[PDB]
Amino acid sequence: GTILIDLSPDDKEFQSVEEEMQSTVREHRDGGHAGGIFNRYNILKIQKVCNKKLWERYTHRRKEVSEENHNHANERMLFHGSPFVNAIIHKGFDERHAYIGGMFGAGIYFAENSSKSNQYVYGIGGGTGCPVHKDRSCYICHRQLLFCRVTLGKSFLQFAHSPPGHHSVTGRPNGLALAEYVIYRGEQAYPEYLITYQIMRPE
Ligand SMILES: O=C(c1ccc(Nc2nc3ccccc3n3nnnc23)cc1)N1CCOCC1
Numbered sequence: 001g002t003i004l005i006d007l008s009p010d011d012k013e014f015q016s017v018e019e020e021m022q023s024t025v026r027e028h029r030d031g032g033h034a035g036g037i038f039n040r041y042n043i044l045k046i047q048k049v050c051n052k053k054l055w056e057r058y059t060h061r062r063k064e065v066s067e068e069n070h071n072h073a074n075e076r077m078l079f080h081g082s083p084f085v086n087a088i089i090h091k092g093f094d095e096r097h098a099y100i101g102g103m104f105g106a107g108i109y110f111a112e113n114s115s116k117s118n119q120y121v122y123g124i125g126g127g128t129g130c131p132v133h134k135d136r137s138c139y140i141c142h143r144q145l146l147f148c149r150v151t152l153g154k155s156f157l158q159f160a161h162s163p164p165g166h167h168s169v170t171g172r173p174n175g176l177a178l179a180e181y182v183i184y185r186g187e188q189a190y191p192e193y194l195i196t197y198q199i200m201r202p203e
């Protein structure tokens, strides 16, 4: 029972979500190899994801975590990129989405940099790029990211099961790079906004 509601570009919600997406683009150490070369996006659509089952599942787990962490869920809004967006918005996050080869163990990874999430849209390392042109830097084909509500709780600061007494891991990666986060329970993230976009070729 997932439905998707389109937001008007005149909606404050559309504008705040776009701004978060645009303002967290950075340059990457791969020179654009995985996610492409761009400074900004063309946002084409932003849809609100509404699923009562997945939400109650999220808030139930949020309450648990909160009570184990001095009444502090440590809830963030973070980006996630994946080939399986469609599965996520209907079935939610689960152990099948655990990135076994990730630097912080077999969990689900999120990012403050939208452009880091962009690198995983066509798979790990950008895969073979867009299905139509096999171009990881394609300026034509439409991409999709998720902007997710994420419960971090007590997060282990790093410079499958979570670390003992901790509900998530914070990776603190470079001075301009923002944090990346890992959760080990699928119930600790809710896929709230689905964003459709293109990367833009710099002028
Ligand atoms: O295709 C994927 C996969 C991998 C990574 C992300 N998403 C992200 N990975 C990140 C890794 C490191 C740092 C940040 C990452 N990130 N930010 N946003 N999304 C990701 C999705 C699917 N998998 C294969 C099937 O089983 C599950 C794993």
Ligand SMILES: [Zn+2]
Binding pocket: 130, 131, 132, 133, 134, 135, 138, 139, 140, 141
């Ligand atoms: Zn393409």
